[PDB]
Structures are given as structure tokens and as C-alpha cells.
């Protein structure tokens, strides 16, 4: 009966920056709003309760303000340990507590173009009737990137899946792996397999390709 809307889905900032995250309620919740921090795979951690009260042991660079429907969480000077996802949560409802959908705070660094590598399917995999073609985008920033598979210059769609690493704790980059999956029969019907990569660090897209059967 009370919907929470968190405003920036994602925030890019550097160590030392001031960060403000916003949380709006569809109904008045007085000051009954709490903030939690969660890192990937880890358990959530209480930071602020009752809109502005700092949980014991939380550093004083965290603060919160607001009453009614509009609330903010502020980090006055980001530290490396502060990059995480943040959730607000209203405790005013007597029907259901609810959470905002989260704001990810990630590390802003200089733009870095990906290094691109393409891998043909192995002979061993082909023997079993399927071909997996893999394209690697290594150590780039920011995380937004586009992979376009082409098979004899036909754009492929719906037959690939991709995965992205969490931001690297040392150089703050991301890496991405994309797999194109074809039947052996389809794979042996075509010649040129291409991975075309678009990223804001590249003035124009980079394509890595191979010809089936060529060393």
C-alpha cells in the first residue's frame, strides 16, 4: 500500500566525491525510513534508521534527511569500501514493509576501451553436435557495451547470452563474455564468424572474426 521509488538506478563517482541518493514514497511515512547497504553476494547492512539516525558503528560520512514522502541518503566523501548497492525501506505501513529497488554506486574512472578476442568452437564440442562461439571484451569502462554477432554478415539475435564481471577492485574495469550457440549443421554451413563491439571508448566499432576451418 506504499510504493518506494529510488531515483538514480546507478551512480558513478570517485573516491572523495559527495553522493546523494533519493527515495520517494507513494504515501506519507513520517520519518519511518531505513537505509541498507549490500555488496554482491553479501548480506544487507543497516546504515540509517528513522530517516536520519546513524546506526552504531557506521562512519559519520553517512547521513540521511527527509520526512513525509521525500528522503535522501548522503555520503559526504566516498571511500573505496562504500561502493555497493543501497536500498531504502519504509516501516510505516501496517500492511507490508517495502523496499526501494536500489541504487548501485560504482567507481568512476577514465574511459577505457575493451580489448576484444574471438574464440571458435573446439573440435571436441563439434563432435557432440553443437558449436559455441565466444567473444571476450576485456578490462573496459564504463560497463555499457554492445556485442553484435554476425554470421556471413547476417546479424544474429536471440541465439546468444552474455555475462559481465563485477567491477574490478584494483583497476575499476569490467569484462564481458558473450557466447553464440549454433547447431553443428548450421555452423558448418557458414564461413565468416564475426564479433562486432560498440563502446564509447571506441571511435568506431571493433570487429574480430575468423573463417571456419582456417588456422
Amino acid at each position: 500500500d506504499i510504493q518506494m521509488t529510488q531515483s538514480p538506478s546507478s551512480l558513478s563517482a570517485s573516491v572523495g566525491d559527495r553522493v546523494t541518493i533519493t527515495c520517494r514514497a507513494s504515501q506519507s511515512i513520517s520519518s519511518y525510513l531505513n537505509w541498507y547497504q549490500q555488496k554482491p553476494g553479501k548480506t544487507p547492512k543497516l546504515l540509517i534508521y528513522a530517516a536520519s539516525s546513524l546506526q552504531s558503528g557506521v562512519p559519520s560520512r553517512f547521513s540521511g534527511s527527509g520526512s513525509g514522502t521525500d528522503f535522501t541518503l548522503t555520503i559526504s566523501s566516498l571511500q573505496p569500501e562504500d561502493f555497493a548497492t543501497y536500498y531504502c525501506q519504509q516501516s510505516y505501513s501496517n500492511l507490508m514493509y517495502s523496499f526501494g529497488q536500489g541504487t548501485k554506486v560504482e567507481i568512476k574512472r577514465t574511459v577505457a576501451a575493451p580489448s576484444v578476442f574471438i574464440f571458435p568452437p573446439s573440435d571436441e564440442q563439434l563432435k557432440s553436435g553443437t558449436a559455441s562461439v565466444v567473444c571476450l571484451l576485456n578490462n573496459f569502462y564504463p560497463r555499457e557495451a554492445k556485442v553484435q554477432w554476425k554470421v556471413d554478415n547476417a546479424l544474429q539475435s536471440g541465439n546468444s547470452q552474455e555475462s559481465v564481471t563485477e567491477q574490478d577492485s584494483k583497476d575499476s574495469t569490467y569484462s564481458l563474455s558473450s557466447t553464440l550457440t549454433l547447431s553443428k549443421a548450421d555452423y558448418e554451413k557458414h564461413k565468416v564468424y564475426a564479433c562486432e563491439v560498440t563502446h564509447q571508448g571506441l571511435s568506431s566499432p571493433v570487429t574480430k572474426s575468423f573463417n571456419r576451418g582456417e588456422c
Binding site: Y32, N34, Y36, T43, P44, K45, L46, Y49, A50, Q55, Y87, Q89, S91, Y92, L95, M96, Y97, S98, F99, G100, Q101, G102, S115, F117, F119, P121, S122, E124, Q125, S128, S132, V134, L136, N138, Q161, E162, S163, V164, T165, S175, S177, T179, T181, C215
Partner: protein, 218 residues
Amino acid sequence: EVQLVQSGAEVKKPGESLKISCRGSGYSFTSYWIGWVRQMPGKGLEWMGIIYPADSDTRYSPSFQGQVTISADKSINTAYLQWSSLKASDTAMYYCARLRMIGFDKNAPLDYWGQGTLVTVSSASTKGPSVFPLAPSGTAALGCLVKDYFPEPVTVSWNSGALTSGVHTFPAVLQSSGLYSLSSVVTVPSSSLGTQTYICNVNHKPSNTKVDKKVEPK
């Protein structure tokens, strides 16, 4: 100080029942409400319900009423969350958490959290991975494709742990077949390809699978 510790990862089939647990210590277990929270893959937090362990007074979120049962055994400081008939859509991480509330409201944040229980619900069955090479060809890249396994997790190392710099082991993807697949890559000096051996070590405990795969230029 205060601690909530939850039971381990679960892998089930649709239609099966399941009960997971949350053990409290370091405080009066019957003096605080315990809440349960759901986090499906890649999504945020949802509140499911609460129980007061002294008398097993419960409140459920409307979305979860009649879909789960929350209970407690106060004699062993443990709360439980149960399904009678699981669905694949119940696949999620489940947290228990202590409500720091005296009386009714006055505040009520969740101040201590369990470490979470992973629940996987799928019609898929246990299967070990096939490991295929990502053969190389300044800086070259190589790796291993760990394909068609169930359930999570798989662990990958390189040269038995001696090679760590430049390794990226990617999150697995769930294929439409119901089986997982992941890749693990490493970048190395092009000069090393002729002389340095590169072997990925893949372990999948649910299937009792151990694989060592040497990867080299073709």
C-alpha cells in the same frame, strides 16, 4: 555479538516441499521479531513476513500469505520458512533478519541479518560440465568454456592456483535447456604461449566432477 546463521544452499524440483532455518544467538530470541526477505536473481529485496518467537505470533505480506509458512522452535533459538509445493519461480536468496522494534513500531529497522540461503528450484537434474578450450590466437587471451552443468556452483582455478593475475571467471548464464554455462579467461604475455603451460582446474561438487584442461595455441 548478535548473530543470525542460516542453513545451507538448497536445490529442489517443482512440487517438492522445503523448510529452511535461521538460528539466533547472542540475545534473547523470544524478545524480538524475526523477519524473512526474498531476493530473486538480479533483483532487489522483498519483505515476506515476521514471527514473534515467544508465542509464534505471525504477520505475512499480502503477496506471500498462503504461499509460505513461518514458524519457530524457541527451545533451540531457531526460526523457519517453509513451502509445501515449490515452483521454479521460488528460486531466490532468502534472508532472515531481526526487527529492532519494542512494542508496536516506534521504529522497526532490521538491524541484524543472516547470511542468506540460496534456493534453486528447477526441473533440471544433476549434471557435470563439459570443459572446452578457448585457445589463444603483446597480450594474448585464452580460457575454458565450462558448459552444460547443474546446479551451481562450479569453482575454477588456473595452474592449481599459481596463476591468478589477469583471471576473469564470469558469472554463469542459465541456458534455455535448464543447464548453466560459464567461461573463465586469462590474459598473458604473447611471448609465454610457447613455453608456459596453462591448465584450468574445474570442480563441480554436486556431480563429483573434477577436470584439468590444458589450453594451448592451435
